[PDB]
Every structure is written in C-alpha cells, then in structure tokens.
Amino acid sequence: FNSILFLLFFIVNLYWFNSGLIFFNSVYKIHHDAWTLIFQTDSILNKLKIYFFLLPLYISSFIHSISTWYYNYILNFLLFSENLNTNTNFVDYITYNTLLLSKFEDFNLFVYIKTLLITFDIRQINLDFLNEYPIILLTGLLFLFTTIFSLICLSYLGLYGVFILNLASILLFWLSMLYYFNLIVSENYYYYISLGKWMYLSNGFRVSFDLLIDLTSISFSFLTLTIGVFVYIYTFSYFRYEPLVERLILFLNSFMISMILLVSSGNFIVLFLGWELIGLTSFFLINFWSTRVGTLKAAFKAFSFNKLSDLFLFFAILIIFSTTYNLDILSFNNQIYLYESYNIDMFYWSINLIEIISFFFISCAFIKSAQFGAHIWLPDSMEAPVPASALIHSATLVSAGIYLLLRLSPLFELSKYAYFILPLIGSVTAFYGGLVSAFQSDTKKTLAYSTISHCGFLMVSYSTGVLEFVILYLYVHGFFKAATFLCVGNVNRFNRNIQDFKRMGGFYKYLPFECLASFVCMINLSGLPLTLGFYIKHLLFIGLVESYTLYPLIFSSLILGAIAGVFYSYRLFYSIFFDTKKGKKAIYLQASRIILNSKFYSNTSLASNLSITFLVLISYTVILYLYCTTLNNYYSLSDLKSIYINNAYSYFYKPDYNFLNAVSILNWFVIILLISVIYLNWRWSYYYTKSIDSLSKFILFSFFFFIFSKYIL
Amino acid sequence: MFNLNTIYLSRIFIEFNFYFLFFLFLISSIIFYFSKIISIQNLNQNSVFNFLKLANIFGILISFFIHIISFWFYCIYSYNLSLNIFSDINLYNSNSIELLNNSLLPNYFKSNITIDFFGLILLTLAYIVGFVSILALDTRLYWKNIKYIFSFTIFLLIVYVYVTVSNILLFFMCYELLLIPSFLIVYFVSPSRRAIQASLYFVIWTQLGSLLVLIAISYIISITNTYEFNDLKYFNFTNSESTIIIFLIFLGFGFKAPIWPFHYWLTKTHVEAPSGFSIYLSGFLVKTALYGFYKFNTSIFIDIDSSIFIAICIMGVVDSSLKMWGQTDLKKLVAYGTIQEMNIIYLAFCWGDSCAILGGILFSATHAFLSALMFFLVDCIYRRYHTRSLVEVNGILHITPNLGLSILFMLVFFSGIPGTIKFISEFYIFSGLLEASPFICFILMLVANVLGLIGFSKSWFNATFGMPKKNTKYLPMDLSFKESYIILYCFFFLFIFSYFSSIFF
Amino acid sequence: GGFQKYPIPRYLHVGQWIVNKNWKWNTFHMFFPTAILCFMVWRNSMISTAKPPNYGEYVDPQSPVAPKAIKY
Amino acid sequence: DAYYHDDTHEGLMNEPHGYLTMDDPMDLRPNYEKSALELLFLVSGGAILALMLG
Amino acid sequence: LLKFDPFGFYSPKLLSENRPEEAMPFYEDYPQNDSHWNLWEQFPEDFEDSNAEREAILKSNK
Amino acid sequence: RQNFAKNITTTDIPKDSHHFAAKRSGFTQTEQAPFAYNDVYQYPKDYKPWNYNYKGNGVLLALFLGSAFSLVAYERSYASKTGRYQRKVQQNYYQI
Amino acid sequence: VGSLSYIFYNSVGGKVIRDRIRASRTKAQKVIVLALAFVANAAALIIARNAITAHNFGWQAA
Ligand SMILES: CCCCCCCCCCCCCCCCCC(=O)OC[C@H](COP(=O)([O-])OCC(O)COP(=O)([O-])OC[C@@H](COC(=O)CCCCCCCCCCCCCCCCC)OC(=O)CCCCCCCCCCCCCCCCC)OC(=O)CCCCCCCCCCCCCCCCC
Ligand SMILES: CCCCCCCCCCCCCCCCCC(=O)OC[C@H](COP(=O)([O-])OCC(O)COP(=O)([O-])OC[C@@H](COC(=O)CCCCCCCCCCCCCCCCC)OC(=O)CCCCCCCCCCCCCCCCC)OC(=O)CCCCCCCCCCCCCCCCC
Ligand SMILES: CCCCCCCCCCCCCCCCCC(=O)OC[C@H](COP(=O)([O-])OCC[N+](C)(C)C)OC(=O)CCCCCCCCCCCCCCCCC
Ligand SMILES: CCCCCCCCCCCCCCCCCC(=O)OC[C@H](COP(=O)([O-])OCC[N+](C)(C)C)OC(=O)CCCCCCCCCCCCCCCCC
Ligand SMILES: CCCCCCCCCCCCCCCCCC(=O)OC[C@H](COP(=O)([O-])OCC[N+](C)(C)C)OC(=O)CCCCCCCCCCCCCCCCC
Ligand SMILES: CCCCCCCCCCCCCCCCCC(=O)OC[C@H](COP(=O)([O-])OCC[N+](C)(C)C)OC(=O)CCCCCCCCCCCCCCCCC
C-alpha cells in the first residue's frame, strides 16, 4: 500500500499497454482478416504467449465488455427497449467481446491522450473563428447572469464581492464589444443569432428569441456599454458610505443589460420585451429612495408614461402582425414597401396603414425620448442618484425613440405623418429645452432640459434623413452628457446634496479636477466653435430640409435652441466654480482645515477622477473614428440598409457661397452671445471701468488683427 | 408508430384517477365518522384532524401527478387520432377502431368518458388551485369546521365528472353541484361577520344564472329528447329557439363568470370571504361557467349577431378598469382585476368555435394562476399585518423584503411582459380583435392596459413602498417557506407554460 | 459624505452595510460557473447564427443557400 | 477620505445576518408543508424532463 | 426591532419559551409560524414503549 | 393553539445549561422564587441563518440523473422516428 | 410510496433538528432515506415515458 509503488506500476502498465496497442495495430494492418489465425491459434503455447504479452489489451477489453454490458442493461431497463442488440447470454457475450481485439485497431493510447490534452488548447483560437462566430453573446450572457445571480445572492457577495464580480463581467463584455465594434461599423459584419423557439403566438406560429447585431444595434450598444463601464466605476465612489451601494450597482447593471437587449433585438417581440424591461428598471432606479413617498410620485409618473408608450408599441406590433404574418425585423423592413399602398378600415375613417403604424411608433418614441408634451416626467426623474440619471439621460432611456426610428427607417420614409411631425416636434422640443436649460438654476435640471433639447435636435436630424449624422449626434451627446453628469454629481456630493448652484461658489479650488473636466465636457457638449461638438450642429443645419410648410417656425426654433447652449454652459460652469462664494460657511471651513493638508487630500475620489478621464479619452477617440468613417472624403461606413438618399452630403462636400455665408449668421450670433455672457456686468464691482476698457481693447485689437491678417500680412 | 397500448393507457389512467380520488375520500370519510362519536376536533396531538389533513393534501398532490401523466397521454392520443383520421385518403379504408372496457371498475354513472383539451386544462386548474387553497385554509379550520377539509376533494370529484362526461344532463348537474360546498365554506369558515350577508348575496346571484342555464337546458332537452351531446348535430333549432337559448346561456353563465352589471356578489364575496377560499373561487369556480358556455354554444348553431354580447363583455372590462383606481382595499382591487380578466376571457368566446377559443383557454389558465398569486399575497399581507387596507398598511418592503419583492414581481407579471402566458393570451385576443373591430380593440387595450393598470399599480406600489413607522412592536418577520414556495411555483408556471406544445394552442 | 451608520436588527435579512469576509471565494465560485453556463449557452446558440458573406464572396442565385420562392 | 473608519474597527459594519424565512431553525413540529411544496416542484421538474423535454 | 429575536441564534432562547410571571399560568409563546400542517408525533423505529412501571408493580403485587 | 408535544424522542434537543443559572442561596424576604428550567437553545457552530445550510448531494444527483435519462430517451426517440436502431451521425453538420 | 417516504423523512422538524437526526442516522438508513423517494418517483416517470415512446416497432432498419 504505497503511492509510489502504485504510480510506478500504473506507469509500467501504461507503457506495456501502449506497446501492445502498437504491435496489434501493425499486425492488424498486415493481416486485416488473418490476424485471428495467429492470435487465436489452437496451440497452447502460442495462446499462452499471446495472452501474457497482450494482458493489458485483454484486461482492457474485458473491462470494456463489462461496462458495455452493464450500460446496455441500464438502457434496456430505462427505456423498455429491445435487447443488447441480440439476446446473447452473459457468458457468450463477455467471452466473445473479450477475445475480440479489433476494437484497438485504430486506437493508440499516446495519440488519444495527446488529443484529449490539445482539445482544451487555447493557442488554436483565431480571429477568423471569432469573426465567423460572435463571442459578444458569450460575454453579454456573462454580464446578465452575473447581475441576476448577484442580485439573488447578496449575502454571499458583500459590497466588495458584488463590485468585483460585476466589474469583471462588465469589463469582459466591453472589451468584446470594442473588438467587434470595428468590424461591424466599417467591415460590414453583422450577425443574426437565435437562441430558440420562445413562444407560440398563433394557432401554428412560434416566435424565436433572436438578436440582431447590426450597425444600427451596435451603434447604441457600444455607446451604452462604454458609458456604463465608467458609470459603474464612478458609482462606487458617488454612493460611497451609503447603506445600499450593491442595490444601486445591480440596478444600473440591470438597466444596462435591458437597454442592450432592446437595441440588439431580432424581432418585435424581443424589442417589446426590452422596451418593458428598460421601463421597469428605470422605474426602480428613479424609485431607489423607496422609503420616501415623494420619490414614488416621480417614479409613478415615469411608470405611467412608460405604460402609455408600451400600449402604443404593442398596438403597432399588433397591426404589423395582422398585416404581415411575421414579426421579424428584417422581413418587415424589406416587406413594408409592398403594403405601403394598403389602408385600414377603422371606426369611421379609412386610415393609411403606413400612416397609422408610423403614428403609433412615433407616439411611443416621443414619450420615451421626452419630446414636448410628453417630457413632463424627465425633469421629475432626476430624483434618481446621479449615476442612474447620467445613464438614463445620456444614451439609455432617452434614446429609445431614436433607436426605434433608425431601426424602422424604411417604414417612416414612406410616412406622411412622420414627414410633417418629426421636424416640427423636434425643433419645438429643441427650442423649449434649450431655453429652459439656459434659465435653469439646478445642475441636474439643467442637464435634463439640455438632454430634452438634444433629443429634439436628434429628431430634427432624423427628419433631415442622414442616418450617419444622427448616429454622430447621438454619440457626441451621449458621451459628453454622461461626463458632465458625473462632474455635477461630484459637485453635488461635495455640496452635501444641494444641487442648486445659487449655494455654490468658489469650488474651483476645492474640486480642481471637476472644474477642468467640466470645462472640457461642457464646451464639447454645448456646440461651440473649435470643439468636437460643433460639427453635429453644423451637419444638422446642412441637412435641414426646406420644403416644410412650417419651415419658418422650425428654423427659428432650431436657431434659438442651438444658441441656447452657450448660456446654460456658461451659467453652470461659472456659477458652480468661479462665482463668489455663496454656499454655507461649513462647506468651505470643514475642508479648509490645515490638518487635512496631505498628499492624499482631495474632495473627490481618485477612482472617480480616473473614470472620468478615461471616459473623456475614449469618447474623443470613438467620435474621431466615426468622423473619419462618415465625414471623410472616402466613405467607409457599413451599409445602413436604406435606399433613401437625401442629397445632404452635397452641401458638405461642395458647399456653395450662399450656404457658406448663411452659416456665418449663426456663427456671429453665437459670437455676440459669448461676448454678452463674458463682458456683461450685472453687479457693481471694483472692475467695472477696467472691464469696459478691456472690452474696448479687445474690439480694437480684433479689428487691427483682422486687418493685418487679411491685407497687410 | 402510435399503437393501441397508448390509447388504452390513456383511457385507463383517466378512468382510474377518479376512482383513486373517490376511494381516498371514502376511506378518509369513513375514518372521520367512525373514529369519534361527534365529528369535531379533539384539541390534542393525537387528533384525527392531522390524519385527515395529511390524507387530503397528499391525495390531491398524488392525484395531480397522476393527472399530469394522464393529460400527457391524452395529448398524444388526441394528436395521433387526428393524424389517423387525416392521413388516409383511400376511399375503401376508414378508421373504425372499437375499444372494450375494463372488467375491474365500473363506469361512473354508466357514462363513457370523453376528454378534451379544455376540460383537462380546467381539471389541472382545479388540482393546482385546490392545492393552494387547502394549504391556505389550515389556520381557518379549527375544531368545528374540520369537516370542510374535504371540500376540495369534493370539488375535484365534481370537476372530474364534469370534464370527463359526454352527457348534457350530467354536465349540467356537475356544474350546479358546486354551489353547496362553496356556500358552506363561506358561511362557516369566513372570519369576518359580513361574510354572513356575502354568502347570501353569492347564493342568490349565482342561483339566478343557474336558473337561466336550467331554462336553457330544459329548452334543449324538451325539444331534443337526446342527451348524448352529439345527437344535436342531426337536430337544428329554429331562429327563435336558437336566439333564446344563446341569450339564456350567456346571461346565466355570465352571472357566475362575473360580467357587468352582475359582479356585485363577486366583490362582496371576495372582500368578506376566507382569504384561502377567495383564491379557489377566483381561480377556478368562475371558469366552469366559461367551459359550460363554450360547450353549449359550440354544440348549438346560432345565427344571431354577437355584437350585444361583445358590448357587454367590453363594458365589464371598461367598468372594472376604471374602478381599479378608487380601491384602497387590496382584496377588492384584486377582485376588480379578476372581473376584468374574466370579462376578457368571456369576450374570447363570443365568436362561436373560432380560433378565439385557444386564446380564451390560455387566458383562463394564466388568470387562474395570476389570481391565485394575487390573493395569496393579499392573504399573507392580511395575516402578518393585521389589515388589508392601504391606509393602515405601508412600507411592506422595508420590514418584509420577500413579500415586497413578491408584490413587485406580481405587478410585473400582471402588466403582461413578454415571456409569459399572460402576454401570449393578450397577443391572441388582441390580434383577433384588431381584425374583428380595430377601434374597439384599441379602446379595450387602452383602458385595460393603461387606466386599469395604473389604478391597480398605484395601491400596490404605495403599500410596498413608504416607511413603516407605526406600531413597531407588532411588525411581522417575513414570508415562510410554504408561502415563498407557493409564490415561486406560481411564477414558475406563468413563465414555463409558454413552452407547452403549440399543437393545442 | 454618506449618511451616518445606524444599528440594523440582527433578525432582519437586509443589505444595509453588509460586508462578507469570504467575498473572495464567493466571487470565485460565482464567476467561473456562470462563465461555463454562458459558454454552454453560447455554443448552443451558435448553431443557429447567420452571417452575411465575406468580402470576396458572392451568393450564387442558383445555389441551394440562395432564397427560394414557394412552389404551388 | 479624511476620517474613514476601517471595517475591522467600524462597529456598525454588518456581516451577513438575518433569518431567510419565518420558519424556526430549531422546531420540534413534524411540519410537512415545506416538504410537500418541494415535492411538488421536484415532481413537476421531473415530469418536464422525462416526458416533455425533447 | 433590535431586541426582537424569536429564534435563539443572536439572543439566547430558553427551552421554556418564556419566563412565567406571578399570578399567571405558564403557557408557551405563540410561534412565529403557526402552520397546522403537522404530522402525528414521530418516534424512532422499533421504539420501546412497554408500560414497564405497570408491569413491575403488577409483578410485585402478584 | 398549538397542541403538539415539545419533548420529542427522535433526537435530543441541543441545549446550553450554563448561560442562565438559578439562585439557590442568599435570598431576601422580598425576592421572588427562582426559575426551575434555565436551558437555552444552542445552535451548531458554522450555521448560517441567511441561507439553506444544505450540504447534501441528493437533489443535484436527482436532477443530473433526470437530465441524463431525458438525453438518452431523446436519443432513442429520434432513432425510432428515423426508423433506425441507433442514430446515424452524419459526417458534417451545418448551422440551422 | 415516493411521496410518503419523502414527506416522512424530511418532515421531522426544523433544519437543525433534521440535520442532527440525519447525522445520527446510520449509513444504510441514510442511503434508503436519500434513495427511496427518488427511485420511486423516477420509476413512475420512466413507466409513464415508456408508453408514449414506441420503441418496440419492428420497422427499425436501414
Ligand atoms: C428565500 C426565497 C424566497 C422566495 C419567495 C419570494 C419570491 C419572489 C421574490 C424573488 C426574489 C427574492 C428571493 C431571492 C433571494 C433568495 C436568497 C437565498 O435564499 O439565498 C440562498 C440561495 C440558495 O443558495 P444557498 O442557500 O447558498 O445553497 C443552496 C444549496 O447549497 C444548493 O444545493 P445543490 O448544490 O445540491 O443544488 C440543488 C439544485 C437546486 O434545486 C432546485 O432548486 C430544485 C429545482 C426543481 C425544478 C423546478 C423548476 C426549475 C425551473 C428553472 C429554474 C431553476 C432554479 C433556479 C432558480 C430560478 C431562476 C433564478 O441545484 C441545481 O442542480 C440547479 C439546476 C436546476 C435545473 C433544473 C431544471 C428542471 C427542468 C426545468 C424545465 C426545462 C428546462 C430546459 C433547459 C434546457 C437547456 C437550457 O441563493 C442562491 O444560490 C440563488 C440561486 C439562483 C439560481 C441560479 C443558480 C442555479 C442555476 C441553474 C441552471 C440555470 C442557469 C443557466 C444554465 C445554463 C445551462 C443549461
Ligand atoms: C421573475 C421571478 C423570479 C422568481 C425567482 C427569483 C430567484 C429565487 C432564488 C431563491 C429560490 C430558488 C433557488 C434556491 C432553491 C433552494 C435550493 C436548495 O438547495 O434548497 C435546499 C432545500 C432545503 O434543504 P433540506 O432542508 O435539507 O431538504 C432536503 C430535501 O428535503 C431533500 O434533499 P435530499 O438530499 O434528501 O434529496 C432528495 C432526493 C434524493 O436524491 C437521490 O436519491 C439521488 C441519488 C440516488 C440516485 C439513484 C441511485 C440508485 C442505486 C443506489 C446507488 C447507491 C446510493 C447512491 C446515493 C448515495 C447518497 C447520496 O430526492 C428527490 O429529489 C426526488 C426527485 C425525484 C423526481 C425528479 C428527478 C428524477 C426524474 C426522473 C429520473 C429518471 C432516471 C433515473 C431512474 C432511476 C431508477 C428508477 O433542499 C432542496 O434543495 C430540495 C429540492 C427543492 C428545493 C426547493 C426548490 C425551489 C425551486 C424554485 C424555482 C422557482 C422558479 C421561478 C422561475 C421564474 C422565471 C420567470
Ligand atoms: C432683432 C435681430 C434679429 C434676431 C432676433 C432675436 C434677437 C436676439 C435675442 C437673443 C435672446 C437670448 C436669450 C438668452 C437668455 C439667457 C438667460 C440666462 O441664462 O440668464 C442670463 C445669462 C446670465 O446669467 P448669470 O447667472 O450670469 O446672471 C443672471 C442675472 N440676472 C438674473 C439678474 C439676469 O446670460 C445673459 O445675461 C445674456 C443674455 C442677455 C443679453 C442678450 C443679448 C442679445 C444680443 C443679440 C445679438 C443678435 C446678433 C445679430 C444676429 C441675430 C440673428 C441671427
Ligand atoms: C377491503 C379493503 C379495504 C381497505 C381499507 C384501507 C385501510 C386504510 C387504513 C389507513 C390507516 C392509516 C394509519 C396507518 C398507521 C400509520 C403509522 C405511522 O404513522 O408510522 C409510519 C409508518 C411508515 O412510515 P415510514 O417512516 O416508513 O415512511 C414511509 C411510508 N411508506 C411506507 C408509505 C412508504 O406508516 C406510514 O407512514 C403510513 C401512512 C399512512 C397514511 C397515508 C396518508 C396519505 C393518503 C392515503 C391514506 C389511505 C387511503 C387509501 C390509499 C389512497 C387511495 C388509493
Ligand atoms: C337582463 C335582464 C335582467 C337580468 C335577468 C335576465 C332576464 C332575461 C333573460 C333573457 C331572456 C331572453 C331575452 C331575449 C329573447 C330573444 C328572442 C326573442 O324573444 O325574440 C322574439 C322571438 C324571435 O322571433 P324571430 O323574429 O327572431 O323569428 C321567429 C319569427 N316568427 C315567429 C314570426 C316566425 O320570437 C318569439 O318566438 C317570441 C319568444 C318570446 C320569449 C320571451 C320569454 C322567454 C321566457 C324564458 C326565459 C325567462 C327567464 C326569466 C329569468 C328570471 C327573470 C327575473
Ligand atoms: C436559464 C438561464 C438563466 C436562468 C436565470 C433566471 C433569472 C430569472 C429572474 C431572476 C430575478 C432575481 C431577482 C432577485 C432580487 C433580489 C432582491 C434585491 O435585489 O433587492 C431588493 C431590494 C432590496 O432588497 P433587501 O436588501 O431588502 O433584501 C435582500 C435580501 N432578501 C430579499 C433575501 C431579503 O428591494 C427593492 O427595492 C426591489 C428591487 C427589485 C429589483 C429587481 C431588478 C431585476 C433586474 C433583472 C434584469 C435582468 C435583465 C434580463 C435581460 C434578458 C431578458 C430576456
């Protein structure tokens, strides 16, 4: 009973068995059918020699025969089926199968072991295999199951356990998404995956659970996931020292996965599922402060609007199913043109089928994008914690309508109602949100109304009909809105949950990183000259159509909304950071104590600063990649699957003098507004006269500098 | 590859499960009657009440397992019977296979058993809902009402004969037998004092419809002397007779399956009845009426416009949905939800034997399970918090997290999320109604799924959320294992029944 | 920054300020099995995945893979 | 932060605690409701696996 | 709520559920779970339960 | 109310008799009499009230055996449907 | 048989009581307690599956 002796005997037996296998294989090759003539020779000496020298083969065959006999008995017992092929007795069967050695003819122990070892070898995996089969599904399922199981098992996973588990899952998901983003956007790669036959929806119909990873899906998915990764990293610092941080983290993960499922939906049933899931998870995030009933009122407002949108979407899907006996998104997109000519007989009116379907879709899209009239819930949804607010308002909850329009664009291209309604409502919402945000005094409310304005601009861009411009606008707005939301969240946490900047002043020194990060993020968000966010508005005005009947109102509202960005950006930044100290004495004194002076001193989190920095860097890189893909001379974007060409790119490639000078009007309007917000004095100061003098110096120097640059050189 | 062995196994299982239940009930009753001079509980650990509870529970459960097996056998049998009829096209060949009865047990009431998918769905609902309700009524049965431990076994036997009979008179008698046990339960087991009047309202309101159905049955039997339920193919009712029969049948069965304006009794009984018996009532006892209406109206040929009946059903749905908001009582709110779902189900049966019946059956199953879930949640709230009123109950989630989570997931399921038989049934009904009358479909969907849904969600969310600062010495602990697993099983069924074979749906 | 910590009843199974000593092993035994489950789901679903042709490939209209209309 | 307290020293950091359900861990009653529901779940799952799956 | 602990894991629980007070009978506290789905008392297999006291007294009496 | 017997014979109740001690000397003329039973419940160490504390493999084995039986039963059913004693595995399988 | 065996074996008391009883349970007694209910239920389900599965058809060929 020695382990060393057992191992040595096992190794010796392995070598003997391998040698016997090789010998039998060679002899079998030589004597395919005549091997028995020598193996089973009647000679006693030869029989004994063969048995002794092939004992490992014989014992292995005996064990295999016993195992096969027992397995066949078990199968017969369980299935009440047949016999062991034949009714051979136990003795006859075992003797025959043990004497038979042909089972080893193609078997080599070393080769088999090597195959088993190399089966798990990871060197083999290649990009080509990944390109053939998408690993995005494997990582998304990982993230989903991690979130679900973490929700269920909270006691097992403490604060740190939940954070680390979900961080690993989300990082893997984001890296895979990043890998496939390059292929889908430019290389014309898209996948249609099916998990199975989900449900039966008619007498003989059964819809499968399918996902569509296309350019339209990936544009939203990658943006949401990239924003969510850094929001997740930031939340652990924002909700620092809170009773319930795991709950908030898991709610954020749930909302992210719900939005990902919605955007990457293969059929209307999955789309509706994702729609309801984002609604429910947004409700939970808004109602996070469950103890308070004041929060429940805002949550219930959002819930009612979401249920109305669900009604509209469900009715539209029912109309589509009744018309075409199909719920597949691709099939519907490629079939809708045939049924365009059809009408539906309703109560007393014959409504055009496309018009009614597009009416319901646009209604639900407006409700979820917080357009004018249906936006009443968005200002009240700010009761959620800042990470949840950023995620919902950047690219997750308020872009659902934009995703719907982009995915079902072939439908709306043949919609008279869409043509009339999208530009008017978009421009009105843009103007309303911009002006209200400019006049707003609270940080979260300002960001919410700015989000409403940018959603209006997105609607107007879709009305223009350049899906590339819409996608660029969506990406820019989402990234920079999220970054600004994180910055204001740090500011609010420092200011002790007081979100109004009337009590904020001189925070530049107390939050140095937030000041500069907010400066960059706001100049990019509010379309300002010489910034990454100027081109989105420039392209929107390039593509704006002029055949509308309400074009005067549409254009005036668009101009006012576009200019409104400057006021809110300036007010937010200046009032928060560089205005006179208006906050309570405690806020400043508690942090100005000399004892706190240390290398570790900070009023924010190092992880939060790093998360914001990485978010800004990645947003810049991705926006540049999209700009190169679309706005470059060589068009390298993937197919959008739309046959409607707007001609808008003509005024981007070869603009005429008329349009070039027309854009200057808005440019100079913005310039005058900047001069007003900078040099305008509302309060007496020691620097009133010197401020007027500086304005005079700037005007005269600008004139002379222009003279020298243009003429004197 | 289908063989006669499967046919006979199906028939034998169906026939013998009934006798299994009957013998269990007979033995339990004999023990109960002959063990004590007076049939009341002896307040000690050695009472026969424990044995009777054990026998009832694990007779229902084992019969439910056998019913699963027999239902699967029936599905295979019906599918292969349809294949046998449909496949062969040669004129000389015809499927005429005759089966000989067993010599072990007799045919109850000298009737040959006939089973249908709707009947077996109804029987499965009976089993499951009866199991839940019996599990609920343990705290109610005490020392003088222990005789009502057999009420659900009696219900199971009645429903078994109801769904496994091809005789019109036996069908009607089984339908009418359900009144006595239910009335006795409400009268003797209900804690509240208003249950005494609620029971009388229930009896009178249901008996008016029972009399209407009795008049219809008398019209059918007196005119057609047949009772086989299939000889009606060779007899045609005139227009006047047919319209009278359909009106009587619809009104009579709508008295039981609540329709506007005949739901006053339902609201009263649900509010004032035992929390464990409300589950059984709403889940099952209102669907025997739907099954009977389906059978009678599909057997009779009707040449009348069903617009009036559709309008009645839609008015009931609208009325219940609009009233949902104004209820601070959770039990009454769930009762209004039951009225809404039952009216939708009844509307699903207004086009004769069209494909609407499939959606109606699926919606009946999902409503049974959903109503059981909702009434069980209300029962848990009332039993641990000694009140079922929104003003007195607030912040359930923060003291009983599992109960609050159950409420939230119940609301999500009630909303009709995809992946649930609730969503599937809504899809069936609305897809049909869109082509039948699109504007009516829009109005029905709008009302039910927005206004009624918001009214329903307001009270439940207000109860779940908030801050329970009142009576801190009397706050409960949490759900028990029994309650938690009942809730989990309801969720599991609502989710997984969507994978049932689509052949019958 | 955060709210002041207050006592939580022992009998109540709530998540207020819950930290687990064995969170490392808990995460280890909750991550890898989930990864294996997702791998199984992924390999099951890949059988029913569709991808368009590659850069240098064209679909022959008469090949079986090409779409076929219903023949009455 | 300035005056953060470690978990090992913070007296109000909670380790996992609480009773999962209302059932008494040490109960002398031969109660069978939990066993009945577990049996129902298991038999339903087994029926699905052995009669319906595939 | 902090004191509340019906089970004995955190706050020790007497086998005698409560401490009787003078001028009151000794009654068991109402359990948190009051389910009546209880079997008859279970005993070990082949449990010895012969009336040994009566047998011994009868043997002594003769 | 509950009528079951507390003193079961299937096993001995875990208990600790040292937490509470009964006074037996030094009484006064105004002090109440001590208590006779002072045993408290003692839980097994490493018992976690927040989970099931289930350490058996019976459920896992039952589920795995059910799944394996379902797999083999489906294999046999497919062979019967194809009219063969066993599955005829093809040389190549494509997506579908 | 399976239902009753499962109920009576797993309905002895609380978690602690059941665990201690099973720990004191002998090896063979533990084996039967674990295996009886599963074997009975599984045999019933297998007998049910056998009828629907018509394997004993003589046309198996090719
Ligand atoms: C407190 C509850 C309150 C409830 C009431 C309130 C309800 C409403 C509110 C809800 C929210 C509040 C409650 C939640 C918090 C609870 C807190 C708590 O109690 O913590 C302790 C609790 C238990 O853990 P523990 O106390 O530490 O230890 C328990 C024992 O040690 C474990 O012992 P063991 O290791 O021996 O495990 C025993 C067994 C567990 O035994 C059982 O649970 C018996 C189940 C019998 C069948 C019943 C139907 C099952 C339907 C599917 C769902 C499976 C159960 C998972 C839970 C539901 C989903 C989340 O484990 C398994 O073997 C799992 C496999 C189960 C598969 C059975 C499938 C049957 C057929 C189904 C239909 C056909 C499917 C075809 C699929 C085809 C291929 C895709 O915390 C958890 O562990 C949570 C687990 C959550 C589920 C995930 C893990 C299982 C995954 C199974 C496979 C599916 C995943 C993907 C597979 C992909 C490949 C196929
Ligand atoms: C959006 C809504 C979301 C809602 C959900 C949110 C998330 C909720 C999360 C929290 C709740 C769920 C997750 C946690 C559940 C609890 C898990 C747990 O561990 O609890 C511990 C829990 C409590 O532990 P305990 O107090 O110790 O109780 C132990 C049990 O009484 C019994 O334990 P045991 O150790 O005594 O094991 C007993 C076992 C005994 O196990 C065995 O016997 C297996 C080993 C022997 C194999 C046979 C060998 C024969 C030859 C002898 C060989 C030598 C001996 C070998 C054995 C040696 C000993 C090991 O017997 C059985 O299981 C009988 C089943 C038989 C029928 C089914 C299986 C067979 C199918 C057919 C097979 C055909 C082929 C085979 C043929 C065989 C020949 C005829 O115990 C269990 O896990 C019991 C299972 C049921 C637990 C509850 C399950 C609830 C599931 C809820 C699902 C809800 C789904 C909602 C979906 C919604 C979607 C929208
Ligand atoms: C008539 C010519 C055709 C054009 C028609 C339109 C005329 C111009 C209309 C401009 C409306 C701007 C509204 C901004 C509201 C900002 C509100 C806010 O945030 O608080 C005040 C913030 C300051 O916020 P604050 O926080 O620093 O202090 C606020 C102090 N209280 C509250 C006391 C007022 O910004 C301003 O004060 C600047 C706005 C006032 C000055 C407006 C000058 C307009 C110059 C127009 C130039 C036109 C150029 C020619 C071409 C135009 C057409 C292409
Ligand atoms: C002409 C013929 C007439 C036949 C009449 C039938 C007479 C029925 C008499 C019932 C007596 C019940 C008490 C028996 C003594 C129990 C002793 C005990 O508890 O020790 C534990 C012992 C053994 O326990 P165990 O620990 O070995 O657990 C395993 C249990 N078995 C053996 C069943 C697998 O006895 C029992 O557990 C038996 C329980 C009996 C009660 C069952 C209740 C469920 C419903 C069935 C009741 C009977 C109705 C008929 C069958 C159903 C319909 C087909
Ligand atoms: C809703 C009321 C409150 C709730 C209680 C419910 C009470 C009413 C229940 C429904 C009764 C049937 C009403 C619809 C009848 C439709 C057919 C019809 O009459 O059209 C003329 C019919 C149909 O005619 P037709 O024009 O279609 O075709 C035949 C034409 N001729 C004959 C000329 C060839 O004509 C008749 O033959 C007259 C029949 C009149 C029958 C009226 C009495 C019915 C008595 C039995 C039921 C009594 C129930 C009482 C319950 C207790 C009340 C308190
Ligand atoms: C086979 C494939 C995989 C199978 C897995 C099936 C999973 C089915 C769904 C499981 C849901 C589990 C929910 C657990 C909730 C636990 C309690 C909790 O979180 O705290 C409650 C919190 C606080 O709980 P607490 O802290 O008081 O108590 C926690 C401990 N207990 C409950 C045990 C006492 O209360 C609330 O405010 C309610 C919040 C509910 C939030 C629910 C969000 C769910 C989001 C899921 C997103 C999934 C996306 C899917 C995308 C694909 C769709 C096709």
Ligand SMILES: CCCCCCCCCCCCCCCC(=O)OC[C@H](COP(=O)(O)O)OC(=O)CCCCCCCCCCCCCCC
């Ligand atoms: C560019 C992506 C960047 C992000 C990647 C994140 C990680 C993704 C997960 C790893 C890849 C999995 C898909 C493999 C595809 C494939 O089969 O690729 C094919 C190769 C073999 O090549 P061939 O099939 O072409 O011959 O597969 C293998 O070699 C299998 C070996 C295992 C691979 C990893 C399995 C991960 C799942 C969990 C394992 C848990 C182990 C036990 C823990 C206790």
